[PDB]
Symmetry: C4
Subunit: 76 residues, 4 copies
């Protein structure tokens, strides 16, 4: 009702389209990330690892190489 | 008048919102690619049974979750 | 310049929230790129005789994971 | 002025919270994904690691093309 509130609502409406795109996409990405973890779970239950070696214990050379490539990509 | 102020506010935010929007957009695209690759991989290498985390969480998944939780707490 | 001082104040109020979102989006984008590189190396070393995508046929494992996560999102 | 600035932020807070929470869980899950790749590849090592700049797997190319069509139509 107040003129200040009307301005605040107008500011939000100017941002709404952009925020909607970000928010909706973040929802789809979050859902897909959860599906990815469920697929990892089913895959590893069916194909178990004798030991689970995480990066703080030892980083696979494949992971190191992939990280270095993407780092160079981002640096360009 | 009022609209010119509102447009000025949005333009001040645009570059930051663009960076966020572009990064989230490519992440969403890559997440969709990731699922298609899972599909092709599992079609070629099927699982006799599909065990989801509500039935049983793999010890490997639990260890990875615990490690990442410690990383996020200390990073 | 009176409007610009207010516009700058509004941005500074949001900066901390926007920085957190932007920095995480950057780390997530980098990790998603690494994930694709690891798929590439994994599939080059372990090629698929045929590549069946979900529009041709959706693996029952993918269908089950999608349904589980969809129920998770609906209940939460 | 400051009361107006806070009103603007509070109007956006709920939308920004949803975005922040979703992005945070996605970032966490992406980290878990990389740790699982590490454990999987330590247990099942690759004789050579071929990245996309050397050669892109036909499976990756096909998946990329399908997803591009999906994003264009959805
Ligand atoms: Cl190491
Ligand atoms: Cl290694
Ligand atoms: Cl782009
Ligand atoms: Cl989980
Ligand atoms: Cl669960
Ligand atoms: Cl369990
Ligand atoms: Cl287990
Ligand atoms: Cl199907
Ligand atoms: Cl199937
Ligand atoms: Cl190529
Ligand atoms: Cl190939
Ligand atoms: Mg096996
Ligand atoms: Mg993955
Ligand atoms: Mg093996």
């Amino acid at each position: 009702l107040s003129e200040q509130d009307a301005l605040v609502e107008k500011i939000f409406q100017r941002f709404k389209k952009t925020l909607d795109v970000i928010r909706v996409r973040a929802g789809h990405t979050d859902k897909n990330a959860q599906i990815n973890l469920e697929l990892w779970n089913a895959f590893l239950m069916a194909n178990p690892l004798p030991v689970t070696v995480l990066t703080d214990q030892h980083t696979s050379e494949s992971v190191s190489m992939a990280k270095e490539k993407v780092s160079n990509d981002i640096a360009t």
